[PDB]
Design a protein around this ligand. Structure first.
Ligand SMILES: CCCCCCCC/C=C\CCCCCCCC(=O)OC[C@@H](O)CO
Ligand SMILES: *C/C=C(C)/C=C/C=C(C)/C=C/C1=C(C)CCCC1(C)C
Ligand SMILES: CCCCCCCCCCCCCC
Ligand SMILES: CCCCCCCCCCCC
Ligand SMILES: CCCCCCCCCCCC
Ligand SMILES: CCCCCCCCCC
Ligand SMILES: CCCCCCCCCC
Ligand SMILES: CCCCCCCCCC
Ligand SMILES: CCCCCCCC
Ligand SMILES: CCCCCCCC
Length: 235
């Protein structure tokens, strides 16, 4: 049990690769937005911020991970805790939701509890990550309920026309949101297996979330940017 409980060069190498891609995406988006009309630029800026924040977090993880600190647990159950990822997520996951919220007429009150659930979700994650013993799973389960809550909120503009900007946006909004929800659900699975259950090692969790992050940030961003460009170009 508790296999490979410390970051090695394998995990470090993976983080440097994700760093490079996040940094490149930020640079590319930053050059692109210069060429686009003003109404589109906020959407580019949101995604520039997301990728810049992720790049910064991966830089920190790649530079410091080999220190093999901090840890949670003792003896045979001791495991490295990589917490920089949560600092990334508490800023980037609301921005990722904002990408889609901007396509809707969600009232402020609604945006508020969606974003609140999102932030709470990340908070429960990092608290759980440092918690030794069975109580970690209370934080985990409530964090999962928060994911359900924010997902429910994001789903409502699909079928509540009073929450829609244009009914014609519904297809793209729906498709992007389902993509998002599918990816986001994998994160607590990785957490439960790694940070929580010590079933998978640290390098493996690093690699899994590196893949998810690439899918959930720059690739997602490209989908959002294509969507707003196509929409704006037609109305
Ligand atoms: C005006 C700025 C707007 C953006 C807000 C800030 C964005 C956050 C930036 C990067 C997020 C993650 C960076 C946080 C850096 C975490 C440090 C770390 O990894 O420690 C390693 C351990 O070995 C030490 O105990
Ligand atoms: C760019 C980073 C992304 C999209 C990260 C998303 C992370 C989550 C959806 C995390 C979810 C979690 C839970 C639902 C339970 C508690 C543990 C977390 C934080 C991993
Ligand atoms: C829609 C939000 C629900 C997400 C629930 C995901 C739970 C997955 C847990 C599997 C990992 C358990 C490892 C012990
Ligand atoms: C909708 C909430 C689902 C939460 C399920 C999380 C899985 C629990 C794993 C706990 C292992 C002790
Ligand atoms: C759309 C589904 C994406 C699945 C990506 C999951 C990545 C983690 C599993 C692979 C670990 C090597
Ligand atoms: C750094 C060069 C990129 C800036 C190009 C500005 C384009 C503005 C013309 C629409
Ligand atoms: C009716 C309440 C539904 C809560 C879950 C939101 C949908 C998420 C699908 C995974
Ligand atoms: C825009 C870059 C998206 C890269 C996603 C690739 C994920 C799979 C890595 C093997
Ligand atoms: C629109 C970005 C919101 C970031 C929230 C940060 C909460 C600590
Ligand atoms: C997850 C909460 C579902 C709330 C359903 C009530 C709809 C008005």
């Amino acid at each position: 049990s508790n296999p490979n409980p410390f970051q090695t060069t394998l995990g470090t190498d993976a983080q440097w690769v994700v760093f490079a891609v996040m940094a490149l995406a930020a640079i590319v988006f930053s050059i692109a937005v210069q060429f686009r009309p003003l109404p589109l630029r906020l959407t580019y800026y949101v995604n520039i911020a997301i990728c810049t924040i992720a790049a910064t977090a991966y830089y920190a993880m790649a530079v410091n991970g080999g220190d093999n600190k901090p840890t949670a647990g003792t003896g045979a159950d001791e495991r490295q805790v990589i917490y920089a990822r949560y600092i990334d997520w508490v800023f980037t996951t609301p921005l990722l939701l904002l990408d889609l919220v901007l396509l809707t007429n969600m009232p402020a009150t609604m945006i508020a509890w969606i974003m609140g659930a999102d932030i709470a979700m990340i908070a429960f994650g990092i608290i759980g990550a440092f918690t030794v013993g069975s109580y970690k799973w209370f934080y985990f389960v409530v964090g999962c309920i928060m994911l359900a809550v924010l997902a429910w909120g994001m789903i409502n503009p699909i079928f509540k026309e009073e929450l829609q900007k244009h009914k014609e946006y519904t297809g793209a909004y729906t498709t992007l949101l389902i993509y998002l929800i599918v990816l986001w659900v994998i994160y607590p699975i990785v957490w439960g297996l790694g940070a929580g259950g010590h079933i998978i090692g640290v390098d493996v969790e690093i690699i899994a979330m590196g893949i998810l992050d690439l899918l959930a940030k720059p690739l997602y961003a490209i989908g959002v940017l294509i969507t707003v460009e196509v929409v704006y170009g037609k109305l």
